[PDB]
Structure formats: structure tokens, C-alpha cells
């Protein structure tokens, strides 16, 4: 997601695994969050696709439902040839929201 500067990409060398998206993140681009013209499949590194993490959401980590894709603009800009777009951080909004809810 491009709306949170704190998040961090893994972007290691990609493997043969295919990324997945949950219900909330379905139909989006893993780089810019765009609903227009999915173009190319998303692949992730074998460290991300291991054990419990297998078949989870690329963006937030929820249960995987549908495949991930790159939008046409990212493919034109060759932003797809950069490594696994899996997010490794947990974010500041999520933890604070959880703590506020569990107040």
C-alpha cells in the first residue's frame, strides 16, 4: 500500500509461488491499489511462502481467497520486475486500532 510510508516490502528474489489476496483486498494492485486492468501475476519469495504463511494475503495477511495481479501502469513502468511485493511490517494504524478497540 502506498498510503502508509511506514510499511516495508520484502522484495527478495521471487520464486515459483503465486501470491493471494483476501476478500477485502480483492481486485487491487499490490503496488498502487488500483482497480483498473490487472495485467501480470504476482510471485513471492520462498521465505514468504513457507509454513503458516502459505496462501495468505500479500497486503494485510488475511486468509487468501483470490490471486494477486499487477496493474497495466505498473507493468508499463516495469514495476513488476522488482522482487516479491509481500509486506513484512505490521503498521502503526493496525496496532493502535487494536489497542483502542481493546481499551
Amino acid at each position: 500500500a502506498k498510503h502508509h510510508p511506514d510499511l516495508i516490502f520484502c522484495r527478495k528474489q521471487a520464486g515459483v509461488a503465486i501470491g493471494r489476496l483476501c476478500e477485502k483486498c480483492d481486485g487491487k494492485c499490490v503496488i498502487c491499489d488500483s482497480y483498473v486492468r490487472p495485467c501480470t501475476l504476482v510471485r513471492i519469495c520462498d521465505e514468504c511462502n513457507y509454513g503458516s504463511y502459505q496462501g495468505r494475503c500479500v497486503i494485510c495477511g488475511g486468509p487468501g481467497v483470490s490471486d494477486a495481479y499487477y496493474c497495466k501502469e505498473c507493468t508499463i513502468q516495469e514495476k513488476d520486475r522488482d522482487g516479491c511485493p509481500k509486506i513484512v511490517n505490521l503498521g502503526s494504524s493496525k496496532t493502535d486500532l487494536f489497542y483502542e478497540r481493546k481499551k
Partner: protein, 71 residues
């Protein structure tokens, strides 16, 4: 973060970058491009009577220490 992405790649500079190393990167990339394409190598091997293997060997030799020693 954009700066982590650009840091890893070889060839990118920053504020405290000198001219010699910039042109060294230019020359190395130019030699690699010459090696890559085919008709440009044919041009170089016709301009001077040398076999393509000799031209490739010379270009590879020039990759180490181009543009002279540093300051």
C-alpha cells in the same frame, strides 16, 4: 521507501559523488552495451581489422581501470 530501492542498484549516486566515478560508471556501462548488441560489435570489428573475439577481449580488458587512476 524509495531510497532503499535505489541504494541497492549499482550505478546510482548521491550528493557527495565525484565526477571521476560517474564517468567510470558511464564507461563501464558503455563497454557492457558494446558487448551486448551484435551489429555494433560488427561495426567495431569492421572499422579495424580485428576478429570479434579480439575486440571482446580488449573491451573486457579495458573494464578494469578505465579513465585512468583516481585522485
Amino acid at each position: 521507501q524509495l531510497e532503499h530501492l535505489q541504494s541497492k542498484y549499482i550505478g546510482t549516486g548521491h550528493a557527495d559523488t565525484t565526477k571521476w566515478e560517474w564517468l567510470v560508471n558511464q564507461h563501464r556501462d558503455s563497454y557492457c552495451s558494446y558487448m551486448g548488441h551484435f551489429d555494433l560489435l560488427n561495426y567495431f570489428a569492421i572499422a579495424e581489422n580485428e576478429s570479434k573475439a579480439r575486440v571482446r577481449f580488449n573491451l573486457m580488458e579495458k573494464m578494469l581501470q578505465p579513465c585512468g587512476p583516481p585522485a
